Design a protein around this ligand. Structure first.
Ligand code: HEC
Ligand code: HEC
Ligand code: HEC
Lengths: 134, 261
C-alpha cells in the first residue's frame, strides 16, 4: 500500500510527516538508488562522503539527518519546491505540470499517464539511507 | 587558469572575459568564454591549430570550398572568392535579420539556400558533419573578432522569443538553461565544470565525442537531458534561442572551432 502522488499529506513548510508506504525503507537499496544515474542520480549535485566525483550544485548531505527532521527530508524528496521554492533540485514524487516531458532521454513525448521519477518505495529507501547520515 | 590569456597560433588575441551585455547586466558581473572553465591541459589544445583536432575538419572544408558540386558545376569559391576574404566577419554577426527572407536566419540556413538555389547540389543535414565542418571554417576565419549580434529592430521579437525559451523550465527534471548556466556557473555537475553556456566558440570540438558539435545539436542535447522533448534542429524555436544565447556573449571574440570537454 503506497500513498499515490495525488494523495500525499504535506504541511505548510512542505514537511511530510508519515511514510509514503508501509514497506520499511531499506537503506542499502537507498544508497544504491542515489548513485544510480537512471533513478536518483543525486550525486550529480550532492556530495556524501560516507559513500566518486560528486557535484557541488547542492549542499553536502553529510550530517543532514543531524540537522533536519525526517518529515522535512521526506518533504524535500516528494516535491523539493514545497521546501525550497524555485530550487533546481527535481521533484521526485510529482506527476503533473511538466513542460515537454520526455520518455527518459529518448526525446519522445510521454503520452498518457506520467509516472514519478521515483516510486513511493524508492523514496522511503532513500529516506532511510539519508537518516543514517548523522 | 580562468584568468589566463588565450592566444591562438601566437597570432590571434581572443577576448575570453568581457563586461556583461547591457540586457544581461543584472545577472553576471562579467561574461566568460567556456574556455575559462576548462583545465589547463584542455585549455592548451585550443592555443595552436596544430593541436586542435577541430581544425582537421576545417582543413577538409577548405578543400570543399574550392570543389565544384551540383548541377551548376560551381564551388563556393566561384562566387565568394577565397574563404578568408569572402566570409570575413560573417560569424560575428549571425544569426541576423536577412533582407531577402524577411526573417532572422542562421549561417546554416544561408549555406543550404546557396547549395540548392545556386549550386543545384544536395542540402547538407543541418547538424551533420559536412555542414558543421563548413560552419567551422567560416567561424575560423573570423577568430578574434567580437561577437556582435543585433537584438533590437527587426530581430527584436525573435530575440524575445529566445529569451523566453532560455528561462523556461523543461522536461521531467524541470530545468531551464538558466537553472544551470546562470545560477550555477562555476559549480560542478558530477565531474563537469559548469560554464555560462556561451556559443561564441561553436562549432565545438568535444574531446568526449571527438567530432565537431553544431549549436543546435548542443541545444537539442541539453533539453533532452532534462528528460524533455527538444525542439527540431533548424526550427524557429532554436533559431530564436540561438540569437538570444549568441547575444549573452556579445563582446567575447569568435573562437570557433573551440576545444571543450
Ligand atoms: C541538482 C539538480 C540536484 C539534484 C539532482 C538533487 N538535488 Fe538535492 N538539492 C539541490 C539543491 C540546489 C539543494 C539546496 C536547496 C536549494 O535549492 O538551495 C538541495 C537540497 C537537498 C537536501 C537538503 C540539504 C540541506 O539543505 O542541507 C536533501 C536531503 C537533498 N537535496 C536530497 C537529494 C536527493 C536524495 C537527491 C537524489 C534523489 C537529490 N537531492 C538530487 C539540488 C539537487
Ligand atoms: C553563386 C552561384 C554562389 C555560389 C556557388 C555560392 N553562393 Fe553563397 N551566396 C550567393 C549570393 C548571391 C548571396 C547573397 C544572398 C542573400 O540573400 O543575402 C550568398 C550569400 C551567402 C551567405 C550569406 C552572406 C552574407 O553576407 O550574409 C553565406 C553564408 C553563403 N552564401 C555561403 C555559401 C557557401 C558555404 C557556399 C558553398 C557551399 C556558397 N555560398 C556558394 C551566391 C553563391
Ligand atoms: C544542467 C542540468 C544543464 C541545463 C539545464 C543546461 N545545460 Fe548546457 N551544459 C551543461 C553542462 C554540464 C555542460 C558542460 C560544461 C560546460 O561547459 O558548461 C553544458 C554545456 C553547454 C554548452 C557548451 C559550452 C561551451 O562549449 O563553451 C552550451 C552552449 C550549453 N550548455 C547550452 C545550454 C542551453 C542553451 C540550455 C537550455 C536549453 C542548457 N545548456 C541547459 C549543463 C546544463
Amino acid at each position: 500500500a503506497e500513498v499515490a502522488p495525488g494523495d500525499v499529506a504535506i504541511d505548510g513548510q512542505g514537511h511530510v510527516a508519515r511514510p509514503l508506504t508501509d514497506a520499511p525503507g531499506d537503506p542499502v537499496e537507498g544508497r544504491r538508488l542515489m548513485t544510480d544515474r537512471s533513478v536518483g542520480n543525486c550525486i550529480a549535485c550532492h556530495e556524501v562522503t560516507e559513500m566518486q566525483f560528486p557535484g557541488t550544485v547542492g549542499p553536502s548531505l553529510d550530517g543532514v539527518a543531524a540537522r533536519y527532521p525526517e518529515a522535512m527530508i521526506r518533504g524535500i524528496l516528494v516535491n523539493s519546491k514545497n521546501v525550497f521554492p524555485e530550487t533546481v533540485m527535481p521533484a521526485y514524487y510529482r506527476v503533473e505540470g511538466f513542460n515537454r516531458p520526455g520518455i527518459a532521454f529518448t526525446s519522445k513525448p510521454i503520452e498518457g499517464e506520467i509516472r514519478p521519477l521515483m516510486t513511493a518505495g524508492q523514496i522511503e529507501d532513500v529516506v532511510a539511507y539519508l537518516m543514517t547520515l548523522t | 587558469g580562468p584568468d589566463d590569456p588565450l592566444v591562438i597560433n601566437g597570432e590571434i588575441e581572443i577576448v575570453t572575459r568581457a563586461p556583461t551585455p547591457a540586457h544581461l547586466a543584472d545577472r553576471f558581473d562579467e561574461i566568460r568564454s567556456g574556455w575559462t572553465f576548462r583545465t589547463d591541459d584542455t585549455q592548451a589544445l585550443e592555443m595552436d591549430d596544430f593541436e586542435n583536432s577541430g581544425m582537421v575538419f576545417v582543413e577538409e572544408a577548405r578543400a570543399v570550398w574550392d570543389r565544384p558540386e551540383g548541377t551548376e558545376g560551381k564551388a563556393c569559391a566561384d562566387c565568394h572568392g577565397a574563404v578568408d576574404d569572402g566570409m570575413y566577419g560573417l560569424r560575428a554577426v549571425y544569426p541576423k535579420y536577412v533582407e531577402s527572407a524577411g526573417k532572422v536566419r542562421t549561417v546554416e540556413q544561408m549555406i543550404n539556400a546557396c547549395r540548392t538555389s545556386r549550386m543545384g547540389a544536395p542540402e547538407w543535414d543541418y547538424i551533420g558533419p559536412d555542414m558543421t565542418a563548413m560552419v567551422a571554417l567560416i567561424a575560423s576565419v573570423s577568430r578574434g573578432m567580437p561577437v556582435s549580434v543585433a537584438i533590437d529592430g527587426p530581430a527584436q521579437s525573435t530575440w524575445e522569443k529566445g529569451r523566453e525559451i532560455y528561462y523556461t523550465r523543461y522536461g521531467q527534471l524541470d530545468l531551464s538553461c538558466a537553472s544551470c548556466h546562470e545560477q550555477y556557473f562555476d559549480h560542478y555537475i558530477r565531474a563537469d565544470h559548469l560554464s555560462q553556456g556561451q556559443i561564441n566558440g561553436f562549432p565545438s570540438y568535444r574531446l568526449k565525442n571527438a567530432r565537431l558539435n553544431a549549436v543546435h545539436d548542443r541545444f537539442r542535447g541539453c533539453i533532452r537531458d532534462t528528460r524533455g522533448v527538444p525542439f527540431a534542429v533548424g526550427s524557429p524555436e532554436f533559431v530564436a534561442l540561438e540569437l538570444y544565447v549568441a547575444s549573452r556573449g556579445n563582446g567575447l571574440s569568435v573562437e570557433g572551432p573551440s576545444v571543450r570537454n
